[PDB]
Amino acid sequence: YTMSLGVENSVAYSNNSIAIPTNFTISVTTEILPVSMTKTSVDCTMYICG
Amino acid sequence: LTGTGVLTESNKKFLPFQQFGRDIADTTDAVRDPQTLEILDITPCSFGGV
Ligand SMILES: *[C@@H]1O[C@H](CO)[C@@H](O)[C@H](O)[C@H]1NC(C)=O
Ligand SMILES: *[C@@H]1O[C@H](CO)[C@@H](O)[C@H](O)[C@H]1NC(C)=O
């Protein structure tokens, strides 16, 4: 299929009118970041020559 | 077949025709001994940085 970009909404704009939030949620959301590779070392001499 | 290693005891299920066994690195990891048909484990001999 041709993929959906999302819900094809349109904002109900006007002059002289505004929308104001009456109620709210706290949200908690994960975010994950890597920080380290596995510290690795090669004895190039033993690796090449056994 | 030459090498240097720790010749440990093995439980490895050698099939009747098999002469030796390898790990992924082409490293021969087990041998049927040619004088007595017991199976040796060629465990890695230790090395590290100074
Ligand atoms: C603002 O919207 C009203 C209708 O609500 C319209 O009559 C008026 O012309 C608009 N004025 C401007 C400056 O857009
Ligand atoms: C906000 O939403 C919660 C949902 O449980 C509701 O109980 C509460 O009455 C609402 N508060 C306001 C100020 O609208």
Contact criterion met (CB below 8 Å) for B30 and B42: yes
List the determination method: cryo-EM
Cite the beta strand spans of chain B per DSSP E: 6-9, 20-22, 28-32, 39-43
Sequence letter at residue A28 = V
DSSP states along A8-32: -------SS-----S----------
Torsion angles phi and psi, residue A30, rounded to 5: -70, 150
Indicate the resolution in Å.
4.1
Comparing CA positions, the residue from B9, B31, B4 lying closest to residue B20 is B31
- Give yes or no for residue A38 CB within 6 A of ligand 1: no
The answer for A35, left when phi > 0, alpha when psi is -120 to 50, beta otherwise, is alpha
| Residues of A whose CB is below 8 A from B47 | 43, 46
| Residues of B whose CB is below 8 A from A42 | none
